[PDB]
Amino acid sequence: RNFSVGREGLEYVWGNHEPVRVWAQESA
Amino acid sequence: FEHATTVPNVPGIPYKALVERAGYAPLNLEITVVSSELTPSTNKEYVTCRFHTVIPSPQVKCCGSLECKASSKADYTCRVFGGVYPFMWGGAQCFCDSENTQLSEAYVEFAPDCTIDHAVALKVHTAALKVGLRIVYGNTTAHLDTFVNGVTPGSSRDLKVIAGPISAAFSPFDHKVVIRKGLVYNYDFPEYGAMKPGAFGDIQASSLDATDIVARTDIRLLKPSVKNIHVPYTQAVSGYEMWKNNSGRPLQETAPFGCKIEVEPLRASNCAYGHIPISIDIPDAAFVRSSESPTILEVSCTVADCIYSADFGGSLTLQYKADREGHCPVHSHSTTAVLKEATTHVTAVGSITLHFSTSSPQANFIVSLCGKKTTCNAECKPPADHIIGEPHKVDQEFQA
Numbered sequence A: 001r002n003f004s005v006g007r008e009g010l011e012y013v014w015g016n017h018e019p020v021r022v023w024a025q026e027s028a
Numbered sequence B: 001f002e003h004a005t006t007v008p009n010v011p012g013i014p015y016k017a018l019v020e021r022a023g024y025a026p027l028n029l030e031i032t033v034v035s036s037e038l039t040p041s042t043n044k045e046y047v048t049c050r051f052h053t054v055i056p057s058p059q060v061k062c063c064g065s066l067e068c069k070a071s072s073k074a075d076y077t078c079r080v081f082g083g084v085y086p087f088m089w090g091g092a093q094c095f096c097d098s099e100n101t102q103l104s105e106a107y108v109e110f111a112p113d114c115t116i117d118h119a120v121a122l123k124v125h126t127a128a129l130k131v132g133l134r135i136v137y138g139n140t141t142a143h144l145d146t147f148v149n150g151v152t153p154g155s156s157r158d159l160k161v162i163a164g165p166i167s168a169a170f171s172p173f174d175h176k177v178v179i180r181k182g183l184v185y186n187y188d189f190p191e192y193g194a195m196k197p198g199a200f201g202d203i204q205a206s207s208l209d210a211t212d213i214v215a216r217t218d219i220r221l222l223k224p225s226v227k228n229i230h231v232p233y234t235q236a237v238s239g240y241e242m243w244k245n246n247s248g249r250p251l252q253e254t255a256p257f258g259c260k261i262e263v264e265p266l267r268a269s270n271c272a273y274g275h276i277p278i279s280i281d282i283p284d285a286a287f288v289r290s291s292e293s294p295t296i297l298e299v300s301c302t303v304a305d306c307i308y309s310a311d312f313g314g315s316l317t318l319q320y321k322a323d324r325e326g327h328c329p330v331h332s333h334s335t336t337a338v339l340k341e342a343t344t345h346v347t348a349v350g351s352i353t354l355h356f357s358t359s360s361p362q363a364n365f366i367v368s369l370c371g372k373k374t375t376c377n378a379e380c381k382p383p384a385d386h387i388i389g390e391p392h393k394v395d396q397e398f399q400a
Ligand SMILES: *[C@@H]1O[C@H](CO)[C@@H](O)[C@H](O)[C@H]1NC(C)=O
Pocket: A001, A002
């Protein structure tokens, strides 16, 4: 699945695991 | 002395600032948002669950005459029919086989499993924020919890802090809140007394043990035709299980700004939005004069390679000429640059290395070490990494 993330971040929950927060950089 | 800053309200990251008294040596402060609980005000108007349609036993007069009696049960339905001639095992429970007038009774009452599986509906008001703050000044640290209003103070044995108000007020809750088994739904509920058949809140009561249970889920009785005695009764299906089937996703999965909604009490924990204005009354005993802490003579900025990433991807080297060994703190006084370290040991003649992070592609930030400043000029390459598992500590300015 292709998930677009923003600069503020995005939190994804895969199953019953701990939610993991990711953040996008400025690698243009 | 009173110092007021504008800390961004993001938990988990430190904010570094350096106080500058007129006649005293500068001191470092580091504020971290260890917790922040947004707790609205809730009141219980009713509870709901799957109802159990309890059927009272029908009773017959042989060929007399009956009447409907008004009751106070939840959706009390009463209907009087004509001749039935019931059969149980001997086939004659009534003489005078013409006009065997029969009574049918039906009402709903809570299931015994509603003590766990039940949904409570809530309406919330304007929510107040309470924030937990960890502060350190120099060598002495302190932990404190305070309310966000701009009025209520916080004290840990030396300190007076005023926090708030929030510049941009935000509430993830709607006007209508439903709690079921710890899951929070922003689903609109019908009001008290205005039940809807086949929808949510078809049975309402102030508590699980309340006797004032009010409901109306459309029980209509039917005339019985079988010789064997049995009352027929047809209904709309329970709207509680339909609302369970057509639930959607809870606000642990769809609340904006990324915060875990907690229940008992209903609250929002560690939810980053806006900036917090905090004013700190630092006690005067923590300060030390500039004649005790050693000051440097000259300092120059020799900058290493830099990357404008979300991690500390920049290195820098400062050479200094001082008079005595000491513990000068470091601070980058720009809004586009922060430092990994807040203080360092400073010799008489020598040089030290330091790490920094930035977001602008260019480096035009100002560096201070016991008061005096020295600019730094560098160009930062775009980062090779695309997604890092550490948030941006800094924000990019407009056209910078
Ligand atoms: C995801 O993006 C890549 C790169 O554009 C593309 O090759 C791939 O087909 C996309 N997959 C989906 C699920 O759309």
